[PDB]
């Protein structure tokens, strides 16, 4: 009869329907999680419909939700605001999160009007946090599969995932972007297809290696020149102060050296140890490289 109670019940039932539509895009594990969440939401709906006469959820449910919160929190690294909807699954889950927030406001209003349902409000808040975490986890999983595809180097998974909205500039715990892996393995086509959609050529790993430094380290002319036409920093310095030309001279790639020189590389740059690329060439006894470097 009371309008707030009916509105809260309707909003919760909408929330459980949205959970139902979302639960068809996840694996078995999140599917089971969402099913027991449906069970708890139905319990809350039954409790509210009786004005607290029928016993509802128990504190074990909230403890379980907090356990899940911690479990998915250890596996996520939130650093800045992210645009919702990285992939279909994340978008569905975040929509469910917003509906959960609406139902949470409804339950809070009902509690303020009647003094019951505080545990339901806490459960819904935990549900909102859990859905946000699940969306971020799905995004991270897609990024990890993208990294796996880049390491494999055969581009079908790369393109299907990139079209699917997987984060292009996601990084491993080492800090390597898919561009870094593509440069390391030696599959350029992935490098171009990633660079087309705004891939940052100047990404920095935890080891100081940019994609261009490591790519030139492997002696891959094609990938390096593709990076250069895409605005690669010809004189970017690593964690040891090395420019691309220093590492180019380290393995004696004359063609890489001359390409870098054509694009503004500094022959006499200083690293942390003070070594210059020309002096590096002199040290190893290669004379044609020094002649080109001079």
GROMACS .gro file of C-alpha atoms in nm:
model
  294
    1UNK     CA    1   0.000   0.000   0.000
    2UNK     CA    2   0.283   0.238   0.087
    3UNK     CA    3   0.434   0.403  -0.221
    4UNK     CA    4   0.803   0.385  -0.110
    5UNK     CA    5   0.779   0.011  -0.038
    6UNK     CA    6   0.616  -0.065  -0.374
    7UNK     CA    7   0.870   0.154  -0.556
    8UNK     CA    8   1.161  -0.018  -0.378
    9UNK     CA    9   1.021  -0.362  -0.462
   10UNK     CA   10   0.976  -0.267  -0.827
   11UNK     CA   11   1.326  -0.120  -0.851
   12UNK     CA   12   1.478  -0.429  -0.687
   13UNK     CA   13   1.288  -0.656  -0.925
   14UNK     CA   14   1.418  -0.447  -1.214
   15UNK     CA   15   1.766  -0.491  -1.066
   16UNK     CA   16   1.726  -0.868  -1.054
   17UNK     CA   17   1.603  -0.872  -1.414
   18UNK     CA   18   1.908  -0.672  -1.519
   19UNK     CA   19   2.128  -0.917  -1.330
   20UNK     CA   20   1.950  -1.191  -1.522
   21UNK     CA   21   2.026  -1.033  -1.858
   22UNK     CA   22   2.387  -0.968  -1.758
   23UNK     CA   23   2.458  -1.318  -1.628
   24UNK     CA   24   2.461  -1.456  -1.984
   25UNK     CA   25   2.793  -1.294  -2.078
   26UNK     CA   26   3.025  -1.423  -1.804
   27UNK     CA   27   3.192  -1.754  -1.724
   28UNK     CA   28   3.056  -2.021  -1.492
   29UNK     CA   29   3.198  -1.860  -1.178
   30UNK     CA   30   3.047  -1.514  -1.213
   31UNK     CA   31   2.731  -1.684  -1.338
   32UNK     CA   32   2.696  -1.872  -1.010
   33UNK     CA   33   2.782  -1.559  -0.814
   34UNK     CA   34   2.507  -1.370  -0.994
   35UNK     CA   35   2.260  -1.654  -0.940
   36UNK     CA   36   2.309  -1.649  -0.563
   37UNK     CA   37   2.287  -1.270  -0.585
   38UNK     CA   38   1.946  -1.316  -0.748
   39UNK     CA   39   1.854  -1.542  -0.458
   40UNK     CA   40   1.954  -1.278  -0.203
   41UNK     CA   41   1.771  -1.003  -0.393
   42UNK     CA   42   1.456  -1.215  -0.395
   43UNK     CA   43   1.504  -1.266  -0.021
   44UNK     CA   44   1.527  -0.889   0.027
   45UNK     CA   45   1.216  -0.837  -0.187
   46UNK     CA   46   1.025  -1.089   0.023
   47UNK     CA   47   1.144  -0.924   0.345
   48UNK     CA   48   1.044  -0.575   0.228
   49UNK     CA   49   0.707  -0.692   0.096
   50UNK     CA   50   0.612  -0.808   0.447
   51UNK     CA   51   0.732  -0.485   0.617
   52UNK     CA   52   0.994  -0.683   0.809
   53UNK     CA   53   0.753  -0.953   0.930
   54UNK     CA   54   0.935  -1.221   0.729
   55UNK     CA   55   1.302  -1.278   0.809
   56UNK     CA   56   1.529  -1.173   0.522
   57UNK     CA   57   1.900  -1.190   0.450
   58UNK     CA   58   2.162  -1.277   0.710
   59UNK     CA   59   2.499  -1.121   0.792
   60UNK     CA   60   2.678  -1.421   0.638
   61UNK     CA   61   2.571  -1.288   0.297
   62UNK     CA   62   2.735  -0.951   0.364
   63UNK     CA   63   3.048  -1.124   0.494
   64UNK     CA   64   3.059  -1.330   0.175
   65UNK     CA   65   3.018  -1.015  -0.034
   66UNK     CA   66   3.302  -0.844   0.152
   67UNK     CA   67   3.518  -1.151   0.096
   68UNK     CA   68   3.448  -1.125  -0.277
   69UNK     CA   69   3.524  -0.752  -0.262
   70UNK     CA   70   3.867  -0.819  -0.116
   71UNK     CA   71   3.930  -1.107  -0.357
   72UNK     CA   72   3.863  -0.893  -0.663
   73UNK     CA   73   4.028  -0.588  -0.507
   74UNK     CA   74   4.366  -0.758  -0.477
   75UNK     CA   75   4.356  -0.828  -0.853
   76UNK     CA   76   4.269  -0.474  -0.971
   77UNK     CA   77   4.478  -0.155  -0.989
   78UNK     CA   78   4.248   0.146  -1.005
   79UNK     CA   79   4.453   0.450  -1.105
   80UNK     CA   80   4.219   0.699  -1.273
   81UNK     CA   81   3.863   0.739  -1.396
   82UNK     CA   82   3.780   0.498  -1.678
   83UNK     CA   83   3.514   0.533  -1.943
   84UNK     CA   84   3.245   0.270  -1.877
   85UNK     CA   85   3.183   0.004  -2.138
   86UNK     CA   86   3.525  -0.125  -2.240
   87UNK     CA   87   3.359  -0.447  -2.352
   88UNK     CA   88   3.002  -0.575  -2.375
   89UNK     CA   89   3.028  -0.770  -2.051
   90UNK     CA   90   3.166  -0.471  -1.862
   91UNK     CA   91   2.891  -0.248  -1.999
   92UNK     CA   92   2.619  -0.491  -1.892
   93UNK     CA   93   2.767  -0.523  -1.545
   94UNK     CA   94   2.804  -0.148  -1.502
   95UNK     CA   95   2.444  -0.095  -1.612
   96UNK     CA   96   2.347  -0.344  -1.342
   97UNK     CA   97   2.561  -0.141  -1.101
   98UNK     CA   98   2.371   0.178  -1.179
   99UNK     CA   99   2.038   0.001  -1.137
  100UNK     CA  100   2.168  -0.131  -0.805
  101UNK     CA  101   2.247   0.225  -0.698
  102UNK     CA  102   1.893   0.332  -0.786
  103UNK     CA  103   1.749   0.043  -0.586
  104UNK     CA  104   1.987   0.133  -0.303
  105UNK     CA  105   1.850   0.487  -0.292
  106UNK     CA  106   1.498   0.342  -0.290
  107UNK     CA  107   1.586   0.109   0.000
  108UNK     CA  108   1.750   0.397   0.188
  109UNK     CA  109   1.431   0.602   0.147
  110UNK     CA  110   1.225   0.307   0.271
  111UNK     CA  111   1.456   0.270   0.572
  112UNK     CA  112   1.427   0.640   0.652
  113UNK     CA  113   1.048   0.610   0.630
  114UNK     CA  114   1.013   0.288   0.834
  115UNK     CA  115   1.342   0.213   1.009
  116UNK     CA  116   1.395  -0.128   0.846
  117UNK     CA  117   1.619  -0.255   0.569
  118UNK     CA  118   1.955  -0.116   0.680
  119UNK     CA  119   2.111  -0.459   0.620
  120UNK     CA  120   1.947  -0.457   0.276
  121UNK     CA  121   2.104  -0.117   0.206
  122UNK     CA  122   2.446  -0.246   0.311
  123UNK     CA  123   2.397  -0.552   0.090
  124UNK     CA  124   2.304  -0.333  -0.207
  125UNK     CA  125   2.607  -0.110  -0.153
  126UNK     CA  126   2.829  -0.417  -0.141
  127UNK     CA  127   2.656  -0.536  -0.458
  128UNK     CA  128   2.732  -0.205  -0.630
  129UNK     CA  129   3.098  -0.225  -0.536
  130UNK     CA  130   3.107  -0.589  -0.643
  131UNK     CA  131   2.958  -0.512  -0.984
  132UNK     CA  132   3.206  -0.229  -1.038
  133UNK     CA  133   3.490  -0.465  -0.946
  134UNK     CA  134   3.355  -0.736  -1.176
  135UNK     CA  135   3.344  -0.494  -1.468
  136UNK     CA  136   3.702  -0.386  -1.407
  137UNK     CA  137   3.808  -0.750  -1.371
  138UNK     CA  138   3.651  -0.838  -1.707
  139UNK     CA  139   3.835  -0.546  -1.867
  140UNK     CA  140   4.164  -0.661  -1.714
  141UNK     CA  141   4.102  -1.017  -1.832
  142UNK     CA  142   4.045  -0.894  -2.187
  143UNK     CA  143   4.367  -0.694  -2.167
  144UNK     CA  144   4.551  -1.003  -2.045
  145UNK     CA  145   4.416  -1.207  -2.337
  146UNK     CA  146   4.534  -0.927  -2.566
  147UNK     CA  147   4.882  -0.953  -2.413
  148UNK     CA  148   4.872  -1.330  -2.465
  149UNK     CA  149   4.776  -1.281  -2.830
  150UNK     CA  150   5.053  -1.026  -2.879
  151UNK     CA  151   5.306  -1.269  -2.731
  152UNK     CA  152   5.176  -1.538  -2.966
  153UNK     CA  153   5.200  -1.289  -3.252
  154UNK     CA  154   4.934  -1.437  -3.483
  155UNK     CA  155   4.705  -1.147  -3.535
  156UNK     CA  156   4.353  -1.292  -3.550
  157UNK     CA  157   4.302  -1.283  -3.173
  158UNK     CA  158   4.465  -0.939  -3.166
  159UNK     CA  159   4.221  -0.790  -3.416
  160UNK     CA  160   3.911  -0.966  -3.279
  161UNK     CA  161   3.991  -0.847  -2.927
  162UNK     CA  162   4.083  -0.494  -3.033
  163UNK     CA  163   3.758  -0.461  -3.227
  164UNK     CA  164   3.581  -0.599  -2.918
  165UNK     CA  165   3.701  -0.302  -2.711
  166UNK     CA  166   3.992  -0.454  -2.519
  167UNK     CA  167   4.222  -0.186  -2.378
  168UNK     CA  168   4.497  -0.112  -2.630
  169UNK     CA  169   4.740   0.033  -2.372
  170UNK     CA  170   4.691  -0.225  -2.098
  171UNK     CA  171   5.015  -0.345  -1.942
  172UNK     CA  172   5.150  -0.653  -1.768
  173UNK     CA  173   5.286  -0.630  -1.413
  174UNK     CA  174   5.626  -0.573  -1.578
  175UNK     CA  175   5.478  -0.266  -1.749
  176UNK     CA  176   5.492  -0.396  -2.106
  177UNK     CA  177   5.215  -0.282  -2.340
  178UNK     CA  178   5.101  -0.505  -2.628
  179UNK     CA  179   5.319  -0.282  -2.845
  180UNK     CA  180   5.621  -0.390  -2.640
  181UNK     CA  181   5.535  -0.758  -2.686
  182UNK     CA  182   5.469  -0.714  -3.058
  183UNK     CA  183   5.806  -0.543  -3.100
  184UNK     CA  184   5.977  -0.815  -2.897
  185UNK     CA  185   5.831  -1.110  -3.089
  186UNK     CA  186   5.868  -0.948  -3.431
  187UNK     CA  187   5.519  -0.928  -3.583
  188UNK     CA  188   5.484  -0.581  -3.738
  189UNK     CA  189   5.129  -0.613  -3.874
  190UNK     CA  190   5.003  -0.616  -3.516
  191UNK     CA  191   5.220  -0.309  -3.454
  192UNK     CA  192   5.054  -0.110  -3.733
  193UNK     CA  193   4.702  -0.225  -3.651
  194UNK     CA  194   4.752  -0.123  -3.287
  195UNK     CA  195   4.918   0.208  -3.374
  196UNK     CA  196   4.625   0.299  -3.599
  197UNK     CA  197   4.380   0.343  -3.310
  198UNK     CA  198   4.588   0.573  -3.089
  199UNK     CA  199   4.850   0.341  -2.941
  200UNK     CA  200   5.105   0.547  -2.749
  201UNK     CA  201   5.443   0.499  -2.918
  202UNK     CA  202   5.617   0.648  -2.612
  203UNK     CA  203   5.489   0.403  -2.350
  204UNK     CA  204   5.736   0.337  -2.068
  205UNK     CA  205   5.775   0.001  -1.896
  206UNK     CA  206   5.916  -0.059  -1.548
  207UNK     CA  207   6.256  -0.149  -1.699
  208UNK     CA  208   6.296   0.181  -1.885
  209UNK     CA  209   6.248   0.019  -2.226
  210UNK     CA  210   6.026   0.192  -2.478
  211UNK     CA  211   5.884  -0.009  -2.770
  212UNK     CA  212   6.135   0.156  -3.003
  213UNK     CA  213   6.439   0.084  -2.784
  214UNK     CA  214   6.355  -0.284  -2.743
  215UNK     CA  215   6.249  -0.320  -3.108
  216UNK     CA  216   6.582  -0.176  -3.223
  217UNK     CA  217   6.749  -0.408  -2.972
  218UNK     CA  218   6.605  -0.706  -3.163
  219UNK     CA  219   6.730  -0.568  -3.494
  220UNK     CA  220   6.384  -0.539  -3.651
  221UNK     CA  221   6.419  -0.269  -3.916
  222UNK     CA  222   6.056  -0.278  -4.025
  223UNK     CA  223   5.900  -0.235  -3.681
  224UNK     CA  224   6.147   0.041  -3.591
  225UNK     CA  225   6.082   0.237  -3.910
  226UNK     CA  226   5.706   0.197  -3.863
  227UNK     CA  227   5.744   0.338  -3.513
  228UNK     CA  228   5.952   0.628  -3.645
  229UNK     CA  229   5.697   0.731  -3.907
  230UNK     CA  230   5.441   0.723  -3.624
  231UNK     CA  231   5.628   0.992  -3.430
  232UNK     CA  232   5.858   0.770  -3.225
  233UNK     CA  233   6.100   0.964  -3.003
  234UNK     CA  234   6.430   0.930  -3.188
  235UNK     CA  235   6.624   1.030  -2.874
  236UNK     CA  236   6.416   0.889  -2.587
  237UNK     CA  237   6.630   0.784  -2.290
  238UNK     CA  238   6.584   0.467  -2.086
  239UNK     CA  239   6.629   0.409  -1.713
  240UNK     CA  240   7.005   0.397  -1.780
  241UNK     CA  241   7.004   0.711  -1.996
  242UNK     CA  242   7.058   0.516  -2.319
  243UNK     CA  243   6.924   0.657  -2.644
  244UNK     CA  244   6.815   0.428  -2.931
  245UNK     CA  245   7.149   0.479  -3.106
  246UNK     CA  246   7.348   0.342  -2.812
  247UNK     CA  247   7.165   0.009  -2.807
  248UNK     CA  248   7.168   0.007  -3.187
  249UNK     CA  249   7.547   0.026  -3.175
  250UNK     CA  250   7.549  -0.235  -2.897
  251UNK     CA  251   7.447  -0.508  -3.142
  252UNK     CA  252   7.600  -0.333  -3.443
  253UNK     CA  253   7.291  -0.276  -3.658
  254UNK     CA  254   7.432  -0.038  -3.917
  255UNK     CA  255   7.099  -0.005  -4.099
  256UNK     CA  256   6.916   0.080  -3.776
  257UNK     CA  257   7.191   0.329  -3.693
  258UNK     CA  258   7.165   0.508  -4.027
  259UNK     CA  259   6.784   0.510  -4.011
  260UNK     CA  260   6.797   0.666  -3.664
  261UNK     CA  261   7.054   0.921  -3.782
  262UNK     CA  262   6.821   1.010  -4.070
  263UNK     CA  263   6.550   1.080  -3.811
  264UNK     CA  264   6.748   1.300  -3.571
  265UNK     CA  265   6.938   1.059  -3.347
  266UNK     CA  266   7.221   1.222  -3.150
  267UNK     CA  267   7.549   1.044  -3.223
  268UNK     CA  268   7.724   1.188  -2.916
  269UNK     CA  269   7.454   1.143  -2.651
  270UNK     CA  270   7.565   1.067  -2.294
  271UNK     CA  271   7.417   0.784  -2.090
  272UNK     CA  272   7.451   0.737  -1.714
  273UNK     CA  273   7.796   0.579  -1.755
  274UNK     CA  274   7.889   0.855  -2.002
  275UNK     CA  275   7.930   0.626  -2.305
  276UNK     CA  276   7.858   0.770  -2.648
  277UNK     CA  277   7.733   0.567  -2.943
  278UNK     CA  278   8.034   0.658  -3.158
  279UNK     CA  279   8.265   0.555  -2.874
  280UNK     CA  280   8.060   0.237  -2.833
  281UNK     CA  281   8.128   0.158  -3.199
  282UNK     CA  282   8.498   0.233  -3.152
  283UNK     CA  283   8.506  -0.001  -2.851
  284UNK     CA  284   8.380  -0.313  -3.031
  285UNK     CA  285   8.622  -0.273  -3.321
  286UNK     CA  286   8.365  -0.213  -3.596
  287UNK     CA  287   8.500   0.058  -3.822
  288UNK     CA  288   8.233   0.099  -4.091
  289UNK     CA  289   7.976   0.185  -3.824
  290UNK     CA  290   8.208   0.450  -3.679
  291UNK     CA  291   8.262   0.593  -4.028
  292UNK     CA  292   7.884   0.612  -4.074
  293UNK     CA  293   7.848   0.760  -3.724
  294UNK     CA  294   8.098   1.034  -3.814
   0.00000   0.00000   0.00000
